[PDB]
Design a protein around this ligand. Sequence first.
Ligand SMILES: Cc1c[nH]c2ncnc(NCC3(O)CCC3)c12
Ligand SMILES: [Cl-]
Length: 167
Amino acid sequence: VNSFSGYLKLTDNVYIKNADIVEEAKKVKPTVVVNAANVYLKHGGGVAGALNKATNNAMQVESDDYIATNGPLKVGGSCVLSGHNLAKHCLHVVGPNVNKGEDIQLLKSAYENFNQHEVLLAPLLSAGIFGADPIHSLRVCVDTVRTNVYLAVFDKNLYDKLVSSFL
Ligand SMILES: Cc1c[nH]c2ncnc(NCC3(O)CCC3)c12
Ligand SMILES: [Cl-]
């Protein structure tokens, strides 16, 4: 039993809700919140910009030190950093950004990072400003993640479309 409330159950391990991941994280304080990161951990917009703003830029400060030490992430890769005031940990996961020409096949590799954590709060990878089809992102999530994932979809119309179209 966990404290995630109001979710619709999609499969044995995948759950979904129309919610702002920022407001959800503040309420639940999950062990792991997933960020929709880029390889430079430049949290300018989309989910990343919103999560960073909620940390008063502390996420960005920590991220800049991480990059200065380790260099950029790989597309499809991840790193674990602090969750600041939002969660214990933030799993920064880089899905492919279609508006950069990146290979959508890397979306499965991106979701595989979730399997290293028993329970996560997360957005759909590569959706929104990363330019992929969110229906596809949900399909890859369900077919790749085996741990317990609570998906927050910010747009109500897209959520209803994701629910109504779910196979
Ligand atoms: C932009 C933003 C702020 N807070 C959020 N919480 C959850 N999801 C988000 N955007 C990603 C999508 O849900 C839309 C396509 C996939 C956001
Ligand atoms: Cl977005």
